[model samples]
Target: ASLKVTVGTANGKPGDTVTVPVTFADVAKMKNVGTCNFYLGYDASLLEVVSVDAGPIVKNAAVNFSSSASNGTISFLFLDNTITDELITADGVFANIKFKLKSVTAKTTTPVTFKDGGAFGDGTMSKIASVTKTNGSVTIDPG
Candidate 1:
């Protein structure tokens, strides 16, 4: 089974108090499946570490949002079994993986470079010099 989450604001804006909810598609069986974990790392080549405010996504889960000043990448990795348990055991439920970025030192270089892939392995998904900040945000869907 695959775990999926939606990122959005519950209310307010930067500085203002807001509730950012990480809506999930399945979470029923996850009720007693332990806790969930999430981490966000930034690319050192493009961004620098300023600050981070990691908060709760679901009722009982662990989340983190961190920045760095090195050439790398940021990611939100959810561990354990949440969606799997929900769909396989309980009915499909709704959950979240919430967090906030208090501050960040954006890329100082031009051309907006990234190392292509992710922080996991070396492949098309391990190159960090291929991502650009272009508009504002970038979304990657796991097919």
Candidate 2:
């Protein structure tokens, strides 16, 4: 595949924090990723959204990042200024998703799901099509 997005896994205990890397793999041969807007969902009872940071892969002179967090979900938007295209010439993370595990006492597991979103192509985002997505998880060990 030309581009594939994968979510990294993490382990944390109650009251601890974890960071998950949402990465773009096999992009060394890719020309450009103009934009990507997606939502990541998690369990509200098990975890809380902390912050989403821009990763080096998508944050450059040509690209920018933005996000919104509400309860158990976060919306991430990354795009270029259209004046230039940041060619994804290497495999790296697009965002660093942080979560704070809630105080709980049971060994639990929750998923970081890739919800309805679009991974756009070069330029006006009309030049490319189709991409792959892989899910990830957050496991909370007993306190």
Candidate 3:
């Protein structure tokens, strides 16, 4: 099966808060997805990650998420090793990351991209195959 991860569009002015959804496509065929890790990268000078919320897809599962502004990276870790029946079998938004646009002198386009640290597994902790990543960008209007 092929997995595609992407970030939603975000357009805002400086000092504004924007929320971007992280979505997954073509993952319905993946059976018994028991664990997942996602990594997101952004421009630190243009945007600051405020918080990350677990979306509907992983809302009932145990999730550990973190972010850093020093290097512009967000990490998500979800695990359900105990429950074999509990699995992610659909394709949809799995998380929402909130960001605050920094004040800038000029309009700028900063990339909120998906990095290569994405990984998923089945009930037996076997890795999924054919995973692909797609990045996104945010347009920050001049303040």
Candidate 4:
């Protein structure tokens, strides 16, 4: 009936690649995911966007990833390739975005969050369910 998108926590060292996969659980018949735009944002001074690759749900789907080091965010859009039976009805991870740990002075957590302008659509035009949000943090210790 609805989908809850979750951000997963992770660890890394300075300049290390810390990747986290965002998931949509209990997809419970939100059924045909036609397209979506999501924003993954964080504060400056702790990290840089490495990349965002497609997860299982969007495998072979049209995906594009981009980011801004100054704005502290990476956002992208995914459109199901309807020709390939892209009807994602089950639960699975939709996004796996990795980050490059910046040069940390001491140690701290950078909260990764979903910014506004997030939207979802259904290919079948069933007025599919809405999306919920959760948070994750990237913590590191540098010697």
Candidate 5:
């Protein structure tokens, strides 16, 4: 089980943008196996996989954070996690996800940051596994 993850974070005033990268290793064997969705918010279960890019190779996507009435944007892909003849390698896949903050939306102050990764069960639309972030924050200026 040899997995590696690299992430970067930055601070931007309103109307600014930032990008974060996500890397995965060892999970390469699990590629095109099971599928999972990507989401942005406090809870991972409420995350949405942004079905706009649904396919067998939708491994990565970027997200644009906005303070608009509607949640900004986040990119995600569905990784096949279903079991197969191949032994599920602990860390075989590698990926880099980018996230940015929009410079034109306004809302309450809430520092934003990337959370965790998630995986679903066999043939199940619901999430069976997921990672979480506990230290992301955002500050909204109420002008």
Candidate 6:
């Protein structure tokens, strides 16, 4: 199955807390998606990671996240232990990341890139194949 990971909405203002939605689209009908691990990159000088909330696809699942403001990287992992036999078959939002915009130079644009090392696994932790990664950006306007 072809799996796509993306970020929605890419603009904000300084001091503004923006919610970036990370969406997942599955076209290959992959089954038994029990865990997912991914990383997001932003500009440390332009934004600060606040929190990440699990989306409907994995809202009931166990989710964990870690952020490094020094390097502007946010790592996330989601796992569903309750549904060992079931699988995610639909495309939807996977997570929502809140970022607080920091002071930046006028008209500065920061890239919110999705780095490598992102993958989804089945119930047995077997990595899914044919997964695609897409990056995004956030523009911080002077307030």
Compare the candidates by TM-score and give the number of the best one: 2
Tens-digit lDDT track of model 2 for 20-97? 999987664455676667887888888888888878877473337788878778888876746454644467888888
Candidate 4 lDDT trough over 10 residues, lowest sum: 61-70
The sequence of per-residue lDDT tens digits that candidate 6 reaches over residues 32-66 is: 46777778888777778887777776644453333
After superposing candidate 5 on the true structure, give the runs of residues whose Cα lies further than 4 Å from its correct spot.
Answer: 1-8, 29-33, 42-75, 79-143
- TM-score per prediction, in order, is 0.28, 0.86, 0.86, 0.82, 0.35, 0.81
Q: Write the per-residue lDDT of candidate 5 for residues 1-143, one digit (tens) a residue.
A: 22233333334454443333333333442232244434434222222112232222233222211121124444344443333432223332223222333333455434334434444332233333333233244333423
Query: Which ranges in model 3 have alpha carbons more than 4 Å from their true place?
Result: 62-71
Worst 10 residues of 6 by lDDT: 61-70
lDDT of 5: 0.34
State in Å the error of residue 31, model 4.
2.3
Ranking by lDDT: 2, 3, 4, 6, 5, 1
Point out where model 2 deviates above 4 Å.
61-63, 85-87
Best by lDDT: 2
Candidate 2 accuracy as TM-score:
0.86
lDDT of each: 0.28, 0.76, 0.76, 0.72, 0.34, 0.71
Deviation in angstroms for 102 in model 4?
A: 1.6
RMSD of candidates 1 onward, in order: 11.8, 2.3, 2.3, 2.7, 9.1, 2.8
lDDT of model 1 at position 51 = 33
Please give the clash total of every predicted structure, in order. Answer: 24, 0, 0, 0, 30, 1
| lDDT score, candidate 3, position 112 | 81
The lDDT of model 1 is 0.28
